[PDB]
Scaffold this active site. Structure first.
Site, PDB file in Angstrom:
ATOM      1  N   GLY A  83      -0.833  -8.848  38.372  1.00  0.00           N
ATOM      2  CA  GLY A  83      -0.157  -8.593  39.636  1.00  0.00           C
ATOM      3  C   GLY A  83      -0.785  -7.439  40.394  1.00  0.00           C
ATOM      4  N   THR A  84      -0.883  -7.575  41.707  1.00  0.00           N
ATOM      5  CA  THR A  84      -1.505  -6.521  42.489  1.00  0.00           C
ATOM      6  C   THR A  84      -1.318  -6.665  43.988  1.00  0.00           C
ATOM      7  OG1 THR A  84      -3.634  -5.465  42.942  1.00  0.00           O
ATOM      8  CG2 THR A  84      -3.615  -7.833  42.538  1.00  0.00           C
ATOM      9  N   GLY A 103     -14.705 -11.145  42.315  1.00  0.00           N
ATOM     10  CA  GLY A 103     -14.609 -11.022  40.875  1.00  0.00           C
ATOM     11  C   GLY A 103     -14.004  -9.773  40.329  1.00  0.00           C
ATOM     12  N   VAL A 104     -13.399  -9.855  39.173  1.00  0.00           N
ATOM     13  CA  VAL A 104     -12.869  -8.632  38.583  1.00  0.00           C
ATOM     14  C   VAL A 104     -14.093  -7.759  38.309  1.00  0.00           C
ATOM     15  CG1 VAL A 104     -11.612  -7.593  36.669  1.00  0.00           C
ATOM     16  CG2 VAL A 104     -10.962  -9.874  37.519  1.00  0.00           C
ATOM     17  N   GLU A 118       1.521  -6.713  26.923  1.00  0.00           N
ATOM     18  CA  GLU A 118       0.467  -6.621  27.919  1.00  0.00           C
ATOM     19  C   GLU A 118      -0.874  -6.925  27.239  1.00  0.00           C
ATOM     20  OE1 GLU A 118       1.117  -2.459  28.984  1.00  0.00           O
ATOM     21  OE2 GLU A 118      -0.738  -1.973  27.898  1.00  0.00           O
TER      22      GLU A 118
HETATM   23  N1  LIG Z   1      -1.442  -5.440  37.106  1.00  0.00           N
HETATM   24  C1  LIG Z   1      -1.000  -6.174  36.090  1.00  0.00           C
HETATM   25  O1  LIG Z   1      -0.879  -7.398  36.138  1.00  0.00           O
HETATM   26  C2  LIG Z   1      -0.578  -5.378  34.856  1.00  0.00           C
HETATM   27  C3  LIG Z   1      -0.100  -5.989  33.772  1.00  0.00           C
HETATM   28  S1  LIG Z   1       0.359  -4.746  32.701  1.00  0.00           S
HETATM   29  C4  LIG Z   1      -0.138  -3.491  33.746  1.00  0.00           C
HETATM   30  C5  LIG Z   1      -0.057  -1.988  33.487  1.00  0.00           C
HETATM   31  O2  LIG Z   1      -1.142  -1.414  34.227  1.00  0.00           O
HETATM   32  C6  LIG Z   1      -1.274  -0.117  33.631  1.00  0.00           C
HETATM   33  C7  LIG Z   1      -2.564   0.588  34.055  1.00  0.00           C
HETATM   34  O3  LIG Z   1      -2.679   0.647  35.477  1.00  0.00           O
HETATM   35  P1  LIG Z   1      -3.982   1.244  36.207  1.00  0.00           P
HETATM   36  O4  LIG Z   1      -3.685   1.405  37.650  1.00  0.00           O
HETATM   37  O5  LIG Z   1      -4.498   2.413  35.465  1.00  0.00           O
HETATM   38  C8  LIG Z   1      -5.206  -0.074  36.073  1.00  0.00           C
HETATM   39  P2  LIG Z   1      -6.434   0.426  37.299  1.00  0.00           P
HETATM   40  O6  LIG Z   1      -6.239   1.867  37.582  1.00  0.00           O
HETATM   41  O7  LIG Z   1      -7.768  -0.046  36.867  1.00  0.00           O
HETATM   42  O8  LIG Z   1      -5.953  -0.379  38.600  1.00  0.00           O
HETATM   43  C9  LIG Z   1      -6.983  -0.882  39.442  1.00  0.00           C
HETATM   44  C10 LIG Z   1      -6.411  -1.682  40.608  1.00  0.00           C
HETATM   45  O9  LIG Z   1      -7.604  -2.116  41.277  1.00  0.00           O
HETATM   46  C11 LIG Z   1      -7.320  -3.469  41.647  1.00  0.00           C
HETATM   47  N2  LIG Z   1      -8.577  -4.130  42.057  1.00  0.00           N
HETATM   48  C12 LIG Z   1      -8.976  -4.293  43.317  1.00  0.00           C
HETATM   49  N3  LIG Z   1     -10.144  -4.930  43.332  1.00  0.00           N
HETATM   50  C13 LIG Z   1     -10.497  -5.169  42.072  1.00  0.00           C
HETATM   51  C14 LIG Z   1     -11.585  -5.802  41.482  1.00  0.00           C
HETATM   52  N4  LIG Z   1     -12.495  -6.412  42.240  1.00  0.00           N
HETATM   53  N5  LIG Z   1     -11.619  -5.876  40.140  1.00  0.00           N
HETATM   54  C15 LIG Z   1     -10.659  -5.384  39.375  1.00  0.00           C
HETATM   55  N6  LIG Z   1      -9.610  -4.793  39.922  1.00  0.00           N
HETATM   56  C16 LIG Z   1      -9.496  -4.662  41.253  1.00  0.00           C
HETATM   57  C17 LIG Z   1      -6.699  -4.019  40.362  1.00  0.00           C
HETATM   58  O10 LIG Z   1      -5.993  -5.231  40.636  1.00  0.00           O
HETATM   59  C18 LIG Z   1      -5.643  -2.936  40.177  1.00  0.00           C
HETATM   60  O11 LIG Z   1      -4.577  -3.238  41.083  1.00  0.00           O
HETATM   61  C19 LIG Z   1      -1.275  -0.423  32.133  1.00  0.00           C
HETATM   62  O12 LIG Z   1      -0.836   0.705  31.365  1.00  0.00           O
HETATM   63  C20 LIG Z   1      -0.264  -1.565  32.029  1.00  0.00           C
HETATM   64  O13 LIG Z   1       0.957  -1.075  31.467  1.00  0.00           O
HETATM   65  N7  LIG Z   1      -0.614  -4.044  34.858  1.00  0.00           N
END
Ligand SMILES: NC(=O)c1csc([C@@H]2O[C@H](COP(=O)(O)CP(=O)(O)OC[C@H]3O[C@@H](n4cnc5c(N)ncnc54)[C@H](O)[C@@H]3O)[C@@H](O)[C@H]2O)n1
Lengths: 823, 207
Positions: B43-44, B56-57, B155
């Site tokens: 989710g985002t 791409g991720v 997760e």
């Molecule tokens: N988002 C989920 O579906 C999800 C499931 S569980 C979870 C929680 O997220 C926590 C960590 O959060 P965080 O913010 O540190 C993760 P991070 O800090 O890496 O977040 C990065 C954000 O960048 C976004 N993004 C934008 N463009 C891209 C790209 N091209 N590739 C990859 N990502 C991109 C990702 O979707 C995410 O929203 C974990 O501890 C966990 O509990 N998130």
């Protein structure tokens, strides 16, 4: 001609020689064409800020002998004419009254064939109710000759019936205290002509020419050029009977000396009788010039007629010689335009058009300028003199000498002459002239009164309202033009103070107006100018309001996504008194929280305790919705305030019933639990919490919706008044009051009309009252429907379901459980 | 392209454009036909969704000392859903809804998916995860799935190298623009999306 600021100012000082008038004419009767002619003739030009043309300055000079024919004090042979612009149709009711309200004279245009049309007839009633003196002009005469090929006498009889019609209206509706205001061709208050070909004349014009060829003082010459006066060609004697001794018929003086010369030129020229034309022309002393000599057919006729009887001059003559100066009219119009005491110091200053008395300037409207999105106030100085820099009391609609509500003691940045499209700075401006002001746009929405007397009432206010009760969603048909709509909308809102463009949360572009027509016009102007791109406009929709009827059944709670923060609150009703007080600047978001608390406590029975804890109003930070911080000992509370307030702006802008705005909704934050670290109590965490807690609270406080309602005032002849009531009982209308004008059979009905029931109202009112009815409606109040907005089949729920589906939302209204904590 | 066919897909606050359940079923069938498997939901925010699906991720500058660095997803849309929203307001104050993304990986990487009962933060976790993946953290061409916190939902953490080998497509599960912050309403999940959403069975013993 061109003029220097000195000339205009000097000319503006001789009010006795000014003429404030408008042109009452149907658009399809050359209103535009005739008005142009005066501009192309007597239009004033000055010797980089442009404005929307609201008025035109016209100069005219007359012979010392003429200035004597003026039955009203004058001074000098120069005359300043203020041609105040008018609406195109009549539906523009509110702004029709506006133009009239600042005019004393009125050039009424009627058609030769069709005579007086229903519309022009109505406006005239209105003009007469303002005590405007009329001057007629029978236009489109050419159509009678070329098309109908009518006889001199048939045409004369027509003018006679036409003029007869007008005076039936004039005498029936002109105020008794004005004296006989009927028009008489013999008296030079009726011209005949063709805007198309550009010609027109007055009996007084032909009387000045035949003046000596008969040895007459034009007084009796023009008196003969109309009616039953005959000149036997044989006996060479004047008679009063249409027959000579043998019983033979005698042609009327009018047909003889006026219609005949003209009829000959038409017959001669349109039949290309090249032998006659030259001879005929030299006789009337009409000299063609070079390239003109070879013209033939209409091309020719058009040139000859213009040089023969210059249209503009006939009009300027009636305007100058018969229309009242700002001095003659204010004496009998003052009382009518002052909701203050008749003997009042200012009302008297109005009657005497006194430039030394306290200021009494009328702002009829706000007009768009090129200088930013600024608006310049357009109006008339009825007393005293306005000066650049001068500091004035800007008394808006709600003002009353007693209170200080709706008052704005500010300084007039600049005073300018409304030279049509351009403006020309001027030091001052004495009473009697139409002028424009710079720097009031933020104190006067549209109409208002400027004064200097601390005990000066407002002048007959023109009710209006900036309340967006009708709106539509605009989309581009070709995605590429999107940026062109995004600019046109910005543009649009920039040209009208009462039009609104904004974006919903769904990202839609919204255009909301004061009423069906007003919105309709804005949509044309958008797709045709401001944007010019093929737009997709949704059907018109009424703006509602979401509100609560009681305190939330139970405390509403919501927790952030973290699950680290919680907001506990309760929603409750705001009294219409307070909502109104908020909507009317009494209760103000910008006030000192303490001073404002004192007001809410004293005049509105609020715990001064609560009132000092107002966190914010909403929507748009000033709406009739509040958030009161009733928490007790919540650490770090102030660190989430900006977020709370933010959530509140959105909760109140689009509520949980069907995305409509909230109104009269009080939110009391009973408690809050926050994470110790700010990193976990940011905007993304609190904003959704609060917004959801509120929705929960609101949905628990017995929800209801309010529908906007109009206050429609209608003018109509006792005869057609029936059709009014006829239409109101089919629109859930509620009659407030019905009055009659003392003398005349002109009733004035006032009623409440649900805005969602006013679509195509005027159209229906038209048929209903034979078109004699003059509608006028402003937003009046919000009415809380009784029905349950949650029950689909209920009247409100019916509104809600449609709306929801229209918005593609889930048909059913969210339970509070959905916004409460999912526990 | 793995989006199935039918006009350009974009992310809106009003919903994902040109993405019906029928399309998703097609895209999913075609992803399996090329040997990819669904591993979870992510989710985002809209801009993020867009990026992930058409670019791409991509890990992008990470804290190389961060041992739990990686791309986070969740088998249960409900848990992913909670992150499908702006995390900070836009200047005026709006927090709009996000989007649910379905993450797939080359089936060939399944050998690197392990599970644990331990909650990832807990002291033990690190050592027990490193035990399972067969090397010191961070996760590389492997993934770990475990409770988000004691008793929470599970997760999944695809290591970055593995994450960049995912193929992400939109979910037919919509976020709510009128209840941002609310919880995913289970009846909003298309029955057909649930049908194609089983998770692979992850190892609990190191290879
Ligand atoms: N988002 C989920 O579906 C999800 C499931 S569980 C979870 C929680 O997220 C926590 C960590 O959060 P965080 O913010 O540190 C993760 P991070 O800090 O890496 O977040 C990065 C954000 O960048 C976004 N993004 C934008 N463009 C891209 C790209 N091209 N590739 C990859 N990502 C991109 C990702 O979707 C995410 O929203 C974990 O501890 C966990 O509990 N998130």
């Amino acid at each position: 001609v061109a003029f220097t600021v000195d000339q205009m100012r000097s000319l503006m000082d001789k009010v006795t020689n000014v003429r404030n008038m408008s042109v009452i004419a149907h658009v399809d009767h050359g209103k535009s064409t005739l008005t142009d002619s005066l501009v192309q003739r007597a239009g004033i030009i000055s010797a980089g800020i442009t404005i929307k043309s609201t008025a035109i300055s016209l100069y005219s000079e007359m012979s010392d002998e003429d200035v004597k024919e003026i039955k009203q004090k004058t001074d000098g042979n120069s005359f300043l004419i203020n041609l105040i612009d008018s609406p195109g149709h009549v539906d523009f009711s509110s702004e029709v009254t506006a133009a009239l309200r600042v005019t004393d004279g009125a050039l009424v245009v009627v058609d030769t064939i069709e005579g007086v049309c229903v519309q022009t007839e109505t406006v005239l009633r209105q003009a007469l109710g303002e005590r405007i003196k009329p001057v007629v002009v029978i236009n489109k005469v050419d159509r009678a000759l070329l098309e109908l090929q009518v006889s001199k006498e048939d045409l004369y009889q027509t003018f006679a019936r036409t003029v007869e019609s007008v005076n039936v209206i004039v005498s029936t509706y002109a105020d008794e205290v004005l004296g006989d205001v009927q028009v008489y061709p013999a008296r030079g208050t009726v011209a005949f002509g063709s805007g198309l070909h550009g010609w027109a004349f007055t009996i007084r014009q032909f009387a000045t020419r035949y003046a000596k060829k008969f040895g007459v003082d034009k007084a009796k010459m023009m008196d003969r050029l109309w009616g039953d006066s005959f000149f036997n060609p044989k006996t060479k004697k004047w008679t009063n009977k249409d027959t000579d001794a043998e019983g033979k018929p005698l042609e009327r003086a009018f047909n003889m000396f006026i219609l005949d010369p003209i009829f000959r030129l038409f017959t001669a020229i349109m039949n290309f009788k090249k032998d006659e034309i030259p001879v005929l022309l030299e006789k009337l002393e009409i000299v063609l010039k070079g390239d003109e000599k070879d013209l033939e057919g209409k091309a020719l006729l058009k040139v000859v007629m213009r040089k023969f009887l210059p249209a503009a001059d006939a009009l300027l003559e009636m305007i100058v010689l018969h229309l009242p100066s700002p001095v003659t009219a204010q004496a009998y119009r003052a009382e009518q335009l002052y909701e203050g005491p008749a003997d009042d110091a200012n009302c008297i200053a109005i009657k005497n058009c006194d430039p030394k008395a306290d200021l009494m300037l009328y702002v009829s409207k706000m007009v768009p300028t090129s200088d930013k999105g600024r608006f310049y106030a357009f109006g008339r100085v009825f007393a005293g003199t306005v000066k650049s820099g001068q500091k004035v009391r800007i008394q808006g609609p709600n003002y009353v000498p007693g209170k200080k509500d709706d008052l704005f003691i500010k300084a007039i940045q600049r005073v300018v002459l409304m030279m049509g499209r351009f403006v020309e700075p001027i030091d001052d401006c004495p009473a009697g002239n139409i002028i424009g002001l710079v720097g009031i746009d933020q104190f006067l929405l549209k109409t208002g009164t400027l004064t200097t007397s601390e005990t000066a009432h407002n002048m007959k206010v023109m009710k209006f309202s900036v309340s967006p009760v009708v709106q539509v969603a605009v989309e581009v048909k070709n995605a590429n033009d999107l940026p062109k709509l995004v600019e046109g909308l910005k543009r649009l809102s920039k040209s009208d103070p009462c039009v609104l463009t904004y974006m919903s949360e769904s990202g839609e572009h919204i255009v909301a107006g004061t009423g069906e027509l007003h919105l309709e016009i804005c949509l044309q102007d958008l797709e045709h100018d401001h944007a010019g791109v093929p737009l997709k406009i949704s059907p018109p929709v009424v703006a509602y309001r979401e509100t609560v009827e009681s305190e939330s059944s139970q405390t509403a709670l919501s927790k952030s996504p973290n699950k680290h923060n919680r907001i506990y609150l309760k929603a409750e009703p705001i009294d219409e008194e307070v909502s109104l007080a908020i909507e009317n600047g009494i209760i103000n978001p910008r006030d000192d929280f303490k001073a404002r608390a004192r007001i809410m406590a004293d005049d509105y029975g609020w715990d001064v305790t609560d009132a000092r804890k107002i966190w914010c109003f909403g929507p748009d930070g000033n709406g009739p919705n509040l958030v009161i911080d009733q928490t007790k000992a919540v650490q770090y509370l102030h660190e989430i305030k900006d977020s709370v307030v933010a959530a509140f702006q959105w909760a109140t802008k689009e509520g949980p019933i069907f995305g409509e705005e909230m109104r009269s909704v009080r939110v009391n934050i009973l408690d809050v639990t926050l994470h110790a670290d700010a990193i976990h109590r940011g905007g993304g965490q609190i904003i959704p919490t609060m917004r959801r807690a509120t929705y929960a609270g609101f949905l628990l406080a017995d929800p209801k919706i309010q529908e906007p309602v109009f206050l429609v005032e209608i003018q109509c002849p006792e005869q057609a008044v029936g059709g009014i009531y006829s239409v109101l009982n089919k629109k859930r209308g509620q009659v407030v009051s019905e009055e009659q004008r003392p003398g005349t059979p002109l009733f004035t009905v006032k009623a409440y009309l649900p805005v969602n029931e006013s679509f195509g109202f005027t159209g229906e009112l038209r048929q209903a009252t034979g078109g004699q009815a003059f509608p006028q409606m402003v937003f009046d109040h919000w009415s809380t429907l009784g029905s349950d907005p949650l029950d689909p089949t209920s009247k409100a729920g019916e509104i809600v379901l449609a709306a929801r589906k229209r918005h593609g939302m889930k048909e059913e209204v969210p339970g509070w459980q959905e916004y409460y904590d999912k526990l | 392209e793995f989006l199935g066919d039918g006009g350009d897909v974009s992310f809106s606050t009003r919903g994902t454009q040109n993405w019906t359940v029928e399309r998703l079923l097609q895209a999913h069938r075609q992803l399996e036909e090329r040997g990819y498997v669904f591993v979870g939901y992510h989710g985002t925010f809209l801009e993020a969704a867009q990026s992930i699906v058409f670019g791409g991720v991509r890990a992008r500058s990470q804290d190389l000392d961060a041992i739990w660095r990686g791309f986070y997803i969740a088998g249960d849309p409900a848990l992913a859903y909670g992150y499908a929203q702006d995390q900070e307001p836009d200047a005026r104050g709006r927090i709009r809804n996000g989007a649910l993304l379905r993450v797939y990986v080359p089936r060939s990487s399944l050998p690197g998916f392990y599970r644990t009962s331990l909650t990832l933060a807990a002291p033990e976790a690190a050592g027990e995860v490193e035990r399972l993946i067969g090397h010191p953290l961070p996760l590389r061409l492997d993934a770990i799935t475990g409770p988000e916190e004691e008793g929470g939902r599970l997760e999944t953490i695809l290591g970055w190298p593995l994450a960049e080998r995912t193929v992400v497509i939109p979910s037919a599960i919509p976020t709510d623009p009128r209840n941002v912050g609310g919880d995913l309403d289970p009846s909003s999940i298309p029955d057909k999306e649930q049908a194609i959403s089983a998770l692979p069975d992850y190892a609990s013993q190191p290879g």
